[PDB]
Symmetry: C5
Subunit: 257 residues, 5 copies
């Protein structure tokens, strides 16, 4: 794939604008955006989380106008949608002290997004190799104790929505040359969410040679995780809470050989 000149003319550009909903587990008909309450196994070997307790990666494959030319992704604007929902501190949460407001959403967060010309490539890593991941999820198979640090057998494509659990997969840094990805894990049970919004910020997707992701088969791949923290119920039980992510991507036509 030798990359040649960019096309010009009114017809040579296009935009993709959409949102990815979060996939936190959705334990019942009222709990879109939440996981099942989190329970703790008594031993490493008995860790067997329910599917509805596991946040998963979000992904959308977006068809582009049919076109050798390829759409090249050049810029991104992105935003977490609904940040102010975390100000609801009145909905049967757990009072921080006698007569106080409910404890707000807080604790471990993972905020991640990617834009590529093909599926995000994943490497499996597990906290505990004896965790049994549930039916309906796609997970590192044949996990060994080495899978707790690095097992090169665990290679996958993020090719299905609400299927790849966040905790056992990361972007594969050995691959992904045709994707740009960005993430932050902020740990701790008390860490405060810090969520910025603005319509004035643009990320340039071009690599060090001036080339953006090139869309194979005229498809653009967007992926996201926005686990904002956990909601604490009055009882003390805790559920992951997630939010949607907005994407606006500008593309141009690029000739290749």
């Amino acid at each position: 794939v030798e990359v040649l000149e960019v096309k010009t003319g009114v017809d040579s550009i296009t935009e993709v604008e959409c949102f990815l909903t979060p996939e936190m587990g959705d334990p019942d008909e009222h709990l879109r955006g939440f996981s099942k309450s989190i329970s703790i196994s008594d031993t490493f070997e008995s860790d067997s989380p329910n599917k509805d307790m596991l946040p998963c990666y979000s992904v959308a494959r977006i068809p582009l106008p049919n076109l050798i030319l390829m759409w090249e992704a050049v810029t991104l604007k992105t935003e977490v949608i609904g940040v102010t929902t975390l100000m609801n501190v009145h909905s049967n949460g757990q009072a921080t002290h006698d007569n106080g407001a409910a404890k707000p959403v807080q604790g471990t967060s993972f905020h991640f997004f990617s834009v590529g010309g093909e599926a995000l490539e994943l490497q499996g890593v597990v906290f505990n190799y004896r965790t049994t991941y549930p039916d309906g999820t796609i997970f590192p198979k044949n996990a060994t104790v080495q899978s707790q640090v690095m097992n090169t057998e665990h290679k996958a494509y993020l090719d299905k929505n609400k299927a790849y659990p966040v905790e056992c997969w990361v972007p594969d840094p050995t691959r992904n040359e045709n994707t740009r990805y960005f993430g932050t894990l902020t740990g701790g049970e008390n860490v405060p969410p810090v969520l910025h919004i603005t319509n004035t910020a643009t990320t340039v997707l071009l690599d060090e040679f001036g080339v953006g992701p090139l869309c194979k088969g005229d498809n653009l791949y967007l992926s996201a995780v926005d686990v904002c923290g956990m909601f604490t119920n009055r009882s003390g039980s805790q559920q992951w809470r997630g939010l949607s992510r907005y994407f606006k991507v500008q593309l141009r036509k690029r000739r290749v050989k």
Copy 2:
């Protein structure tokens, strides 16, 4: 079609004003404060009182009558007014320990401002779709479980002061081409306020093509939220505390086709 800027001394003007916060104002003595926060007994029964809900602030400022020319907003200076009030730790708050001073205002904050040539466009998102928002507020209608992450039916304009609750609306990232907005949510009950003031900092409002918000009908729209945290009363009850926001906007005349 945006054409050239008009020059000459007659071609520039300035807007200077402040927006007061709209925190709920539960009685005649409590401007700047919400009603004390109560917690529902069940998730489904969440039903906040109007005076417990901080709302977006908005001001529409009339500009010198033109006429096609339009005022174009170019720069902003902005500041929270009265940051030092949070040093009042002697006004029947809750002692941090025996014989100590009162706990200062702290916890969840939302600091937000926008400048636009028309009303800020809003997208509704709710923490809990079974929350009953109260009479006298404008809130996402026909909320469903999908409203907890993204329901595109919930579109609105910030066109009325003390009416749109902060917790269920955000700037719509799919619109707002003629507005510049900026916000930060910092969550957590112990989050310290960090408030900077200076008259030496300017934000440039021009987009990537060198064009600022263009003021339709010669009106400038300013919006803000500055929920600084919660004040904790001696009894333990907690009220949101907000402050006013200063705006200085410089505008120039722009020809459009």
Copy 3:
């Protein structure tokens, strides 16, 4: 005044170097730099802080070499909080953080503020609680109404007197102050750790977007400061604000005006 050219050559520049002591309340002959211990009113309506419990803005007016139209124009500032290491005294009748521990250090709500101007800093009054009774001997927002809790434009003043304007009820007026440059940070929370940087290598430029610094009316330079570092906790649990002095070095040049 139209601002014309800068004057060059011998005697066309000068420097001001000084320090401003903090005004925290000074409740007795031994307690310069501290406030009185903070007490809490029994009701919201009855808030009535004693003068010696209220930190105040510091101000100094510095006479410049007499001119004459030429005016002194403030171009750069170096500034520093003086005595930052005093906060390492954790052995002087404080409250142990746990059994056998060192004393809790100074921490909690801070306000670090400084300004340089060619005239008095202009202030806007805002009060946490409009029914607070501010004490005799302080200058405070008069005829406060419930609107004063958010913004009452009647409360305009000049920082024209030292140890008089309480920090908690006045801020720089952003609608004025065109001939002053001001900078401040409020960091709230009872446990916030002080973070205090010192260096003699950092310079702030005071020139506005047109290349013009504060122009000193009557050949006087106005310097203002607040450096409430936090609270000291006594063994008994009582808390006192603690402040430190601020150093200023300002370079000025002569500017012709019409």
Copy 4:
């Protein structure tokens, strides 16, 4: 070595891509990436940590294509911590943060460190407590004296063996290492939250102020790392260090030397 011109042409560049596994102690066949539970000595004098309780430096010596005078010069690095999302497993024999809550996540003291060099990382020994008896199967500061608690120039070593040099008693020697680029952050405190960023868009340039990167003696590239992310607390409250692997991609070019 006098440094002369860079070689050009298709054959003049090469790249190294690999990962280094963490070496946290691996106390049993199920606990790769963890240390043994941390125990506390009764006295300073009796401090005597078992090997499987001591995280160690990771190192790989990577042979490069043979050249011989030309040397491979390391010019850029991309690096990443692998498996950051594993820390979201808060359902696996941990300790509930409060009644009915999720498990306490990995948190507390972290050290994130990496280096790229044309020879082994040079180390200086420094010990918290000179009376610590370091265990069989580790390489540690020898003939430690009280001065070893601050600086004893006898403790010089090379990071030349994997899972051997304990993190707590060795640092990069700032008096040497001119042919290595190293970077590290120790973030202390028992409750500090991990903050782990990932991206494939960030490059670090390895060139010094003269435009010269590490030069690979004998055509070997030396990569070193520590990524102690914090401690995992199990249900009983016992704590174990948890580490993760680090990815490296290094671009190199041929450089002539005399």
Copy 5:
């Protein structure tokens, strides 16, 4: 001194490389790098710290190659705290953070400070409490008055002796020190986590706004440091300051003066 041109040629540059050990109090033969456990006086007036409980500034005077009019001009600095990983020893007679947990790590109030000059660092005395009795064997502000708690211009000194000038009662004098560059951060709070960065890729330029570095009078370079990292808590709860050494590498060039 009128500053004229820089000398060039291979012989016109030199380097100083060294380390300064911390001076934390060293209460016994086994506790180099630590202070005595911290105690708390029963009244503000009775504060009377023992010498071994007080960290002091470190200083080294480094002779340079003899010149005479030429002076050595300090141009760049690389500096690093040595032994950051020692803070990973959480198994040595500390206090478990909770049942079965590891020892609480070094944390709480830190002061990290360094300076490079062509003469002794100039100090200003400021005291937390003017009634503190500083011990024999230290050099401290004399004839302290209540004003010494904020600024008493009598307390001027030179940092001209090791193990002598307590950190808590002296700071760099911002009204002087024109021939020195100094940098420091006080981070307060009993639970503040240490954040210690190491790298050999970072250089600080020591030139002022006129392109002139410190000029070394009598061909001596003066380096000063404080690196109080926090406090170590022993099993009983008693707390001691812990410090680490600091590396300095300074590049100098010959400068003609009149």
